[PDB]
Amino acid sequence: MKIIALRSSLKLAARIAEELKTEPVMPDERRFPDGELYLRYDEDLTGHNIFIIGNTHSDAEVMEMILTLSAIQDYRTKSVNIIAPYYGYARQHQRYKNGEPISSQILTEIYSSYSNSIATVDIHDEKTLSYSKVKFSDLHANDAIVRYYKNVDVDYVVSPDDGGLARVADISAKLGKKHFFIEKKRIDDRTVEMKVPNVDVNGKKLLIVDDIISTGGTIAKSSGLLREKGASKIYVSAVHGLFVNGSENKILQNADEIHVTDTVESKFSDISVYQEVCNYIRDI
Amino acid sequence: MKIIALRSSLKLAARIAEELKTEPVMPDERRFPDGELYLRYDEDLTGHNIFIIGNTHSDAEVMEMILTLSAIQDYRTKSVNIIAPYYGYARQHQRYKNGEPISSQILTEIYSSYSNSIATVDIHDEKTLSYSKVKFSDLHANDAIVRYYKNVDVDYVVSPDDGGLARVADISAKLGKKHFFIEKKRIDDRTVEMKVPNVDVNGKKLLIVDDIISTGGTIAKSSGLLREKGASKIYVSAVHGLFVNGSENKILQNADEIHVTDTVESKFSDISVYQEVCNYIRDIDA
Amino acid sequence: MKIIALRSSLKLAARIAEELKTEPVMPDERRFPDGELYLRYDEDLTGHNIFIIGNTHSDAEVMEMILTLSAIQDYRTKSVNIIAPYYGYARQHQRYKNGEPISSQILTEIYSSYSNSIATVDIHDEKTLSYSKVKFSDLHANDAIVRYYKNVDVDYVVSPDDGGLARVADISAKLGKKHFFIEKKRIDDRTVEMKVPNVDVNGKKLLIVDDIISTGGTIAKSSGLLREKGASKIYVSAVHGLFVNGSENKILQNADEIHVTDTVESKFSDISVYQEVCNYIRDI
Amino acid sequence: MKIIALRSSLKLAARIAEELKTEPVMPDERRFPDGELYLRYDEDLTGHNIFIIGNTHSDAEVMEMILTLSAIQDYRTKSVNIIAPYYGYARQHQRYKNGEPISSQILTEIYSSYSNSIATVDIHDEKTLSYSKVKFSDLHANDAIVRYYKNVDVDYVVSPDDGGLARVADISAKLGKKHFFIEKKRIDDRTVEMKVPNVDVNGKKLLIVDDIISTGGTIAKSSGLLREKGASKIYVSAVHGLFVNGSENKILQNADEIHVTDTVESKFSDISVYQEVCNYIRDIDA
Numbered sequence A, C: 001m002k003i004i005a006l007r008s009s010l011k012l013a014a015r016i017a018e019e020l021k022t023e024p025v026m027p028d029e030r031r032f033p034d035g036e037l038y039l040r041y042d043e044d045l046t047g048h049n050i051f052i053i054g055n056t057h058s059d060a061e062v063m064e065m066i067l068t069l070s071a072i073q074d075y076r077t078k079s080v081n082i083i084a085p086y087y088g089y090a091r092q093h094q095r096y097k098n099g100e101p102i103s104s105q106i107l108t109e110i111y112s113s114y115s116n117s118i119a120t121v122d123i124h125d126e127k128t129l130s131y132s133k134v135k136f137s138d139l140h141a142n143d144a145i146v147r148y149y150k151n152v153d154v155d156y157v158v159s160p161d162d163g164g165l166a167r168v169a170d171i172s173a174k175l176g177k178k179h180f181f182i183e184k185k186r187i188d189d190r191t192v193e194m195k196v197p198n199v200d201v202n203g204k205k206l207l208i209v210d211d212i213i214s215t216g217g218t219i220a221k222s223s224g225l226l227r228e229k230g231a232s233k234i235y236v237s238a239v240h241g242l243f244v245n246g247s248e249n250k251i252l253q254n255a256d257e258i259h260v261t262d263t264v265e266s267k268f269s270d271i272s273v274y275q276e277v278c279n280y281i282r283d284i
Numbered sequence B, D: 001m002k003i004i005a006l007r008s009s010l011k012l013a014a015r016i017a018e019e020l021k022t023e024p025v026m027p028d029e030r031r032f033p034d035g036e037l038y039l040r041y042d043e044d045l046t047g048h049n050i051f052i053i054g055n056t057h058s059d060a061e062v063m064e065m066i067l068t069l070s071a072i073q074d075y076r077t078k079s080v081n082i083i084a085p086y087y088g089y090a091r092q093h094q095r096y097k098n099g100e101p102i103s104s105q106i107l108t109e110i111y112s113s114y115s116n117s118i119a120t121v122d123i124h125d126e127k128t129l130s131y132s133k134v135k136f137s138d139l140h141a142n143d144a145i146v147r148y149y150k151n152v153d154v155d156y157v158v159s160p161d162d163g164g165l166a167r168v169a170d171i172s173a174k175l176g177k178k179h180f181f182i183e184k185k186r187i188d189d190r191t192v193e194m195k196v197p198n199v200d201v202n203g204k205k206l207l208i209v210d211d212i213i214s215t216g217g218t219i220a221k222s223s224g225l226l227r228e229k230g231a232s233k234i235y236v237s238a239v240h241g242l243f244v245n246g247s248e249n250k251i252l253q254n255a256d257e258i259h260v261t262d263t264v265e266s267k268f269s270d271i272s273v274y275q276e277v278c279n280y281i282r283d284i285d286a
């Protein structure tokens, strides 16, 4: 097997390759004077199962993935397998309203056209998996998150909204903890919060888990609610830590700690999903 | 017909739309907080021949094109036709080292999969046309360049290298002028330039034509050479004026004027290719 | 047998002849006033197996080889066998890009046209061996390098890149040592290094081995990385020490010692490959 | 047709190309850090008759020729034709002692293996032509030398030794002049020179012709002899002006002017052989 480690995924890809006892093959990569992307893989990939590891979120990441999918055609490979730790454009994904692209559809079609399989960790909505002609697997960071928090004092695991429930239920079951979620809705300029079930959080230590942190708005609002009601400690975790300005500070206004995975590498990437990805690679 | 005018081609697409008496339909476009691209076309495009006009060279331009090609599937269209006035990655049309992408191949395959036709103006190498499943037409700015310079005093049309010759031959013939090219080559840290044929440029007014100006190195050097040998005027034109890293100023150190087309819009875009693109559009109908 | 010792290979050729108990036959050689090369072999080579030993890298070396291949036709020899310790133009060898010569192809064809066999020590890429009509053997300096380092304190043998792996694996196996390689790639103006496997080099003694040292750039960059990470001693070896200005000083910025073979004779030629070449001659 | 102009022959090859209305194609050429030679020809040479023009006497020239012969195999050519205006190693065309190379033999064999024809101008000894598998033509600078000296006041054409006689006979006949040669020989540390026939050169203007000037010894000596016997003017010409070790100055101690051809370019290259080479090229076609 050959692991290809793209720019966005150097850390996780390196962790993966080390575990698999193989080279994290990196491209030579630069921009031409006119801004066009150049890539080169001088290693002979002929006859190998190839695992390309890189995110598909930014314009540059998409170009790096597409150009890599062309570059490796220089070799008669055994298979080509895309693993995008964080999959871009899975922000639904459908049309609302009309004349909007189903971006994850066309992008998934493209990727699927040039690969034998695709996988990602905790896609934002599973409908997107259906857009692939090849098998598109949804891996989960649950076990890695459970491993991290097994040695932490937690009273409840909490979803910030009424959608990340299955993940919170599974993680809490694995930690042997109770769980609940917060429903937040805006009704005529005023905000209304419901806890479900209506757990008493006074003096309690809470682990809030979500799939993505972008602006941090959702998590920060929920942390503030819980701190207000007397939560004694709030840990914030997510799979994909995008942290667009200035999400970190909004969240730490009321949360004590932030721990996300290495799907998107940042200073808060304390939890690695390499084992989960290695399992997939081993079983593919 | 519906003309979609993407961000990179607003000037040219608007000129095209106005000539064809139709709307230059622009997307509502913005970036999500996380930096992903959002587009929306609220106009009803159902049952029309669609012409999407936008360049394909920057990362953002490629995303704009691809996401537009997804957006239009929300409508039952008659046809979908891509026109990329400047076609990106046409310089990477083969592998020059093992493990390189043939970038123009994969990108052309993608565009072709979601359209009924593709067209560009003066592609850097026509090999790339063969990467397309649908008809991929190579339009030419020649007549537009001729129309501009028929009112300029020109003695010779010149290619700055031994590659853009057919264009220089065609343009010069339509101006009623003679032409030559410059061959520049490095031989052991020394540069040698040959003029072919070895035209005496003393007191002569020269029009240098190339397909793309990016770093402007070859043209700036040739301009200096020709100025050195006594050229009285030097005009520099190219179809695609990218102008990276001071290129226009390096060229103007020795050339008198730069005039490029509006395939890539800049302050040097004095020659519009709108009529050439309009003719192509009329041919494909609508 | 007759050994012919050409200008570039006087030292190794002498070592070879002494071991074989035979004369290292040298040409009378000078330049005509107009710069043309003159050679003469006044010894009677009739009826002997001839072994011409000389490098094929510089313009002058190529002319010396070609003119020697003509000069010896004055004698009815038993066989003519070329041994080029360092083989020039094996810098790939193919066309990248187009309109480039496959230099090692035409040169190998020429040599093969005038000989019964060719051999070299550690050719830079084995594709070149296929360009010969006669048997073209690739000899290896591995055993001589192992002999040298058997009495040196070494923790790991290291390849400076992901291509000289088989040599490093064989040498380390013979020394009873672990090994690893460094993958270096440039990604957007910044440099990225991976160790494979990700060996801890803190306080460790490293032997870095490569086939050729030219500008010393590759080796010097890798030595610097390892010194930076706490390597306690770095030995640098290569088969062919070209050392173009000012490679030696770049390398010794962070390496402790340089030891190369006598394929290309320099002040750093501490390791002789005469036994390896004698084996080939004996078995031909 | 495609003309390739190698480093050593840029002046002559350019003159040839211009006469034939074609590009003098030069390689991009440089040395790798380790001193090995790099060449690249990016022009598409497919389907053309190729004429490679470069000398073959220095180590670098030989490498340039050989590597060019490899480079052109990257193209499907109609034919490959070597023209080495000055052909190196033609002085070593046999063994004069045991164990010497016949250098012109092996080199000719190499060139012939990778071309369809070879040509040179005034080879030092025509024996070498027989070493070539393909047709190896020996062109002559005679008419070019005549064209130059038809406008010079000349009484006799002279060979400086008893070897270059046919050339001196031909040139003198075309100038309408008489001729003689000098025989110089060493007999016991004393030099004896005979003029054949024993022409009185007092007050006479002499044109000395030889194929090659290298160290210039024979010509400098003969010039001094003729000056001593009262020659009023002495012109020295040769096809190949190598000029080693002060040769031109040693000659000019007693000769009035030196004029050689452009087979080897120097400041003395006043007589171009471009027309002779062009005629040959036209014959082989393209």
Ligand SMILES: Nc1ncnc2c1ncn2[C@@H]1O[C@H](COP(=O)(O)OP(=O)(O)O)[C@@H](O)[C@H]1O
Pocket (backbone or CB within 6 Å): A032, A033, A034, A036, B089, B091, B092, B096, B125, D042
């Ligand atoms: N956007 C770009 N800007 C500059 N150079 C590029 C770009 N894309 C590709 N290239 C490079 O240009 C080279 C090919 O150009 P060129 O040497 O003219 O050969 P060709 O005749 O095949 O075009 C390749 O090395 C390729 O990697």
Ligand SMILES: Nc1ncnc2c1ncn2[C@@H]1O[C@H](COP(=O)(O)OP(=O)(O)O)[C@@H](O)[C@H]1O
Pocket (backbone or CB within 6 Å): C032, C033, C034, C036, D089, D091, D092, D096, D125
């Ligand atoms: N490039 C050269 N410069 C000077 N002398 C040379 C060169 N190449 C060969 N020779 C020598 O010139 C001699 C042959 O010349 P010459 O005596 O005129 O006999 P021939 O009549 O056969 O030419 C030989 O000794 C040969 O080694």
Ligand SMILES: [Mg+2]
Pocket (backbone or CB within 6 Å): B091
């Ligand atoms: Mg190019």
Ligand SMILES: [Mg+2]
Pocket (backbone or CB within 6 Å): D091
């Ligand atoms: Mg002689």
